[PDB]
Amino acid sequence: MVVKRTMTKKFLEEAFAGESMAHMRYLIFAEKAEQEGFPNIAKLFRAIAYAEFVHAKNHFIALGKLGKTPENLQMGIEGETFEVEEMYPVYNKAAEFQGEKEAVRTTHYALEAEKIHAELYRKAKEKAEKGEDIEIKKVYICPICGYTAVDEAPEYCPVCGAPKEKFVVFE
């Protein structure tokens, strides 16, 4: 049965947040580990990150927020809408007011590339409540300021201007 008590629900939510942060940290660590002269430490980081993923997935299953995909896409849609509409403009304005180049640059890379996720998820949801799988192939992603390019791939990234060969393909 789903967890109903408030205090333990808060405890499990905080544990899930910590596990997600740890998994992100390990995934980031592995990239620099393989950039140096240690190709095995990256393997260790990847394995431990997968262990953290398993922990966080168990915590997510316990709280009971995961179900059928047609209703599951709505949470992603709402999260993307919140990230693009409200949270990011305020952070960009605050970073402009305080005057940090790095924060402004990162927020600018963020809000301009997060716009397509909501549209893609809405299309996927309205095409996937009848029992059929959507027709999509070769989703491309920029490795610096990831811009979800669908099917075809632009020669240069409109946001950062990276060359096409750097795109990480998914198939």
Which residues inside 80-99 make contact with a second copy, applying CB under 8 A? 83, 87-88, 91, 94-95, 98-99
120 binds a second copy (CB under 8 A): yes
SS3 8: helix
122 binds a second copy (CB under 8 A): no
142 binds a second copy (CB under 8 A): yes
Judge whether 142 is annotated as a binding position: yes
Single-letter residue type at 22 = A
d(CA 62, CA 148): 32
Judge whether 80 is annotated as a binding position: yes
The binding track of 63-92 with respect to Fe ion, each residue x by CB under 5 A or -, is: -----------------x--x---------
Write the DSSP string, 91-160: HHHHHHHHT-HHHHHHHHHHHTTSHHHHHHHHHHHHTSSSS-------EEE-SSS---B-SS--SB-TTT
In angstroms, give the least distance from the CB of 62 to Fe ion: 15
- Give, rounded to a whole angstrom, the gap between the first and last alpha carbons of the chain: 37
Give the dihedral of Cα atoms 134, 142, 119, 137; nearest 10 deg: -10
Which residue among 77, 106, 115, 122 contacts a second copy (CB under 8 A)?
106
Judge whether 157 is annotated as a binding position: yes
Judge whether 160 is annotated as a binding position: yes
Q: Which residues bind Fe ion (CB under 5 A)?
A: 22, 48, 52, 80, 83, 114, 117, 142, 144-145, 147, 157, 159-160, 162
